[PDB]
Amino acid sequence: GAMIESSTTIQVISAGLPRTGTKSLKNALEIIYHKPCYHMFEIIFNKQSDIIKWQNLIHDSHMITTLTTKTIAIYDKLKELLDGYIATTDLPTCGFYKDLMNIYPNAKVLLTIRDKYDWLHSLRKVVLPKSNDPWKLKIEEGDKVLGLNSDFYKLSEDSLKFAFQKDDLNFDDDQVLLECYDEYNRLVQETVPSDRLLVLRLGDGWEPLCKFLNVEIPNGIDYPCVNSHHQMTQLTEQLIKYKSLDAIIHMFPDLI
Numbered sequence: 001g002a003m004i005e006s007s008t009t010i011q012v013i014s015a016g017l018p019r020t021g022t023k024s025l026k027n028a029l030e031i032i033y034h035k036p037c038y039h040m041f042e043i044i045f046n047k048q049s050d051i052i053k054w055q056n057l058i059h060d061s062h063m064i065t066t067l068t069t070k071t072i073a074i075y076d077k078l079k080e081l082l083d084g085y086i087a088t089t090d091l092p093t094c095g096f097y098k099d100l101m102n103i104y105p106n107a108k109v110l111l112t113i114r115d116k117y118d119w120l121h122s123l124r125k126v127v128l129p130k131s132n133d134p135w136k137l138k139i140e141e142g143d144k145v146l147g148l149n150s151d152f153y154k155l156s157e158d159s160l161k162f163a164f165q166k167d168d169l170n171f172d173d174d175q176v177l178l179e180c181y182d183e184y185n186r187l188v189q190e191t192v193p194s195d196r197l198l199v200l201r202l203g204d205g206w207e208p209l210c211k212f213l214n215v216e217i218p219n220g221i222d223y224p225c226v227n228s229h230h231q232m233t234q235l236t237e238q239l240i241k242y243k244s245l246d247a248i249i250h251m252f253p254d255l256i
Ligand SMILES: Nc1ncnc2c1ncn2[C@@H]1O[C@H](COP(=O)(O)O)[C@@H](OP(=O)(O)O)[C@H]1O
Pocket: 017, 018, 019, 020, 021, 022, 023, 024, 118, 122, 202, 203, 223, 224, 225, 226, 227, 228, 229, 230
């Protein structure tokens, strides 16, 4: 097809929860749009200074009304944080999908989903291991190498609670998490007009996404498959072993 000049503004809002293929989608959207897509990885590896900003935003975000003077100030900060990006994925953004829709009225919405039990297992391996899981200590040790402290975990946990709209959440309760997962995905599809939404299941690949966005399928390029829990386990172990990101960064080409 013809090459056209795309606007550098949020064009795609993905409401997908972590461990539903957000990093692969991040990579895919960057392949399509040739501009950056937001993701927790963007925070970890490029903008750790954004952590306090997202934490602040979440703290104020209960005073959001579906436009008040308070809402406008919050929307202004949200827009600021996302300046220069063409899409959003992953925590902490996914919980803000309704607000992002208002801020970017011409953006389309995605929902990445998968088997709930596969999701739970993936979550326990990477994002939210149980309190008494020994692997939790390995995750934390490796993350320290990345310069991530307790404020990172606060943001991750609090942005997840925001997504689920829970004041308190028993992170060690599998059944609770599974229920929140189903309820969340259910609510996105009830909330977003079907015209404006595409639901993507893991494995769907380029075709439904590119049709939804009216772009050509990227020629010669397979749809990204990155950020498996096996790969995160390896990254954690290698960070612990080498004690720096730069010593091992060439070993994880498209992942980070
Ligand atoms: N193209 C693809 N096909 C199938 N699974 C994919 C995929 N891209 C990513 N995934 C899976 O999605 C999860 C990563 O999601 P996220 O980037 O949001 O954290 C991983 O699941 P597993 O942990 O079960 O391996 C990863 O294997």
